Design a protein around this ligand. Structure first.
Ligand SMILES: [Ca+2]
Lengths: 375, 254
């Protein structure tokens, strides 16, 4: 029997949080949208100025914006002079489960709080998140950071745990348990080609244990619905792409096109030629970004218009000699065309009458060109 | 830190009730039931009722009725723990009064969530049950509920699945033996992206994640686990729908 010392502080907090009558609302959200959008976000950031967006960045941001819609989710129950008074904090401080691997292997799990989140845009939020991350990683966190957690987030889904029912400490209104973003247990045995061909996508089991003294089942149930609406919304990703300097149209949650691969093939062939004819019309060649509508005012380049969805992204199409390969996945086809035409080099080569000249430019444009040497 | 602490008045009653539920040791049994049967049967029920005499059956009508008939099979599900003169005595109520989560949208938008009770459910057929349900609904909607309606809830039912919340782990209040949390009747998250023509061609159906949080001082995991199994047997049974069609004046085979 070893007496607890530093961990005894954690033990007393579990006993203190026992007076809190909690309940838990659980909901599954299809994540196939933010997965396929992260694909573009981290590729575009890597090819321009660095930076990497993780799934928690999007998750925490949606939590913060949903807190604005539901005010009682930030508040926490308290008793002042024998009165049932509920504290309404000025700043919505998102607590994070940051596991600091110590000097002798001691995994010191801390709750760092990103403060003044309600007064932030996607850029300001991820800047304050990465400050709290860079400083926690190098042990430079002040004691003031740990004081002020009004609402928090945990990720038991890191270890593959589908969903959890967390225990809520005093001082908080609710704590969101983000589940395991993955394919369900039954599908784990089938081939990827089988799954994408039917239209089954990965999902996150988002839980929300809340204080039942102040927050009631309807408010917490609607709070999780609101987060679901954001994670599958179009304006949410429109705002995120604007803040990340991405001028291109983000992926939209579209339900599978029930057409055959033969029917879809001629659409994909035609879309390739459409990107070759007017790749320059939707490229980021204006350094001043004066006309922001040039990126969205083109249906001949919009994939959703050509009878295609994010589900068709992983399917093979008989693209006759596109990137040399006679067969290619849709997400590979749209990535070659993005980097070749819609990046910073608009190409008008289709209007030339000599054929070998078009063939020549096609090879020198539709290839993943090597990044120049540091010299 | 620039905060506003408001003293609770009417809501303070709700706060002190959440404290009383702290002494009730609760555990929750969760079970998913394919609802494709009651969905396709509701299709016929509301079409036949519309073409003959009016009336509309909602999914909660069928759900509450099955809860009431399952309570007859398991008696310990209606009972609630109590202490009389320092003795562990369990109350066995005479009438099984099903609690309803009725959200009354008030005068200034104030959604006053009440717990009305359909009484003497054990002595009822499908017709008598839905008549007593619609009386409690029509009167709650127009603020004509007596204080006598709220006193007597022996077993309650909540619907977090209204807002799309897959399943919930509710908090059980004192005076109730068990409270059932009806999940969201829908297709799972993964399938949400595929076409309807794809789904029906394979044979995948909608489902409801029915939860059951109970008082561990009297009810045990096996009884609550079997209670939910019994409800599932009913929601996919043939005689259950045969009885309902008889009570609704539908002569055709369900
Ligand atoms: Ca499943």
């Amino acid at each position: 029997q070893i007496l607890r010392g530093a961990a005894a502080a954690v033990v007393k907090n579990m006993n203190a949080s026992l007076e809190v009558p909690t309940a838990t609302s659980v909901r599954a959200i299809p994540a196939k949208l933010m997965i396929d959008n992260r694909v573009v976000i981290n590729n575009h950031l890597k090819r321009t100025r660095g930076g990497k967006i993780s799934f928690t960045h999007l998750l925490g941001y949606a939590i913060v914006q949903a807190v604005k819609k539901f005010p009682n989710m930030n508040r926490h129950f308290a008793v002042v002079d024998g009165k049932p008074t509920a504290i309404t904090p000025a700043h919505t401080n998102l607590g994070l489960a940051i596991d600091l691997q110590g000097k002798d292997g001691n995994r010191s799990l801390v709750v760092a709080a990103i403060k003044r989140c309600e007064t932030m845009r996607f850029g300001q939020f991820i800047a304050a998140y990465e400050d709290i991350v860079r400083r926690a990683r190098d042990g430079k966190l002040t004691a003031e950071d740990f004081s002020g957690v009004t609402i928090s987030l945990t990720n038991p889904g890191t270890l593959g745990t589908v969903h959890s029912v967390p225990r809520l400490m005093q001082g908080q209104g609710a704590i969101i348990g983000a589940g395991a973003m993955e394919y369900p247990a039954e599908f784990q045995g089938a081939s990827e080609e089988r799954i994408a061909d039917l239209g089954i996508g990965k999902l996150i089991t988002l839980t929300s244990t809340y204080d039942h003294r102040i927050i009631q089942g309807a408010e917490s149930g609607d709070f999780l619905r609101t987060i679901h609406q954001l994670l599958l919304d179009d304006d949410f990703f429109d705002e995120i792409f604007r803040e990340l300097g991405i001028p291109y149209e983000p992926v939209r949650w579209r339900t599978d096109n029930p057409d055959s691969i033969e029917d879809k093939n001629a659409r994909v062939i035609e879309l390739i030629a459409a990107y070759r004819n007017r790749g320059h019309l939707m490229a980021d060649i204006d350094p001043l970004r004066l006309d922001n509508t040039r990126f969205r005012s083109h249906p001949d380049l919009d994939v959703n218009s050509h009878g295609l969805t994010l589900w068709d992204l992983d399917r093979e199409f008989k693209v006759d000699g596109f990137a040399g390969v006679q067969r290619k996945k849709l997400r590979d086809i749209l990535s070659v065309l993005r980097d070749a035409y819609c990046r910073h080099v608009g190409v008008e080569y289709t209007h030339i009458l000599e054929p070998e000249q078009q063939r020549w430019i096609q090879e020198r444009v539709e290839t993943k060109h090597d990044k120049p040497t540091v010299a | 830190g620039d905060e506003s602490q408001i003293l609770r008045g009417a809501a303070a009653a709700v706060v002190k009730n959440m404290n009383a539920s702290l002494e009730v040791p609760t555990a929750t049994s969760v079970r998913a039931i394919p609802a494709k049967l009651m969905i396709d049967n509701r299709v016929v029920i509301n079409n036949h009722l519309k073409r003959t005499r009016g009336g509309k059956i909602s999914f909660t009508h069928l759900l509450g009725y099955a809860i009431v008939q399952a309570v007859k099979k398991f008696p310990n599900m209606n009972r609630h723990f109590a202490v009389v003169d320092g003795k562990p005595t369990a109350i066995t109520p005479a009438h099984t009064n099903l609690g309803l989560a009725i959200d009354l949208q008030g005068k200034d938008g104030n959604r006053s969530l009440v717990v009305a009770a359909i009484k003497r459910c054990e002595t009822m057929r499908f017709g008598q049950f839905i008549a007593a349900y619609e009386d409690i609904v029509r009167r709650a909607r127009d603020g004509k509920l007596t204080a006598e309606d709220f006193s007597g809830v022996t077993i309650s039912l909540t619907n977090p699945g209204t807002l799309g919340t897959v399943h919930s782990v509710p908090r059980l209040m004192q005076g109730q033996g068990a409270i059932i949390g009806a999940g969201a009747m829908e297709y799972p998250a993964e399938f949400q992206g595929a076409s309807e023509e794809r789904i029906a061609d394979l044979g995948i159906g909608k489902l409801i994640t029915l939860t059951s949080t109970y008082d561990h001082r009297i009810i045990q995991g096996a009884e609550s686990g079997d209670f939910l199994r019994t409800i599932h047997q009913l929601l996919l049974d043939d005689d259950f729908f045969d009885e309902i069609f008889r009570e609704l004046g539908i002569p055709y085979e369900p």
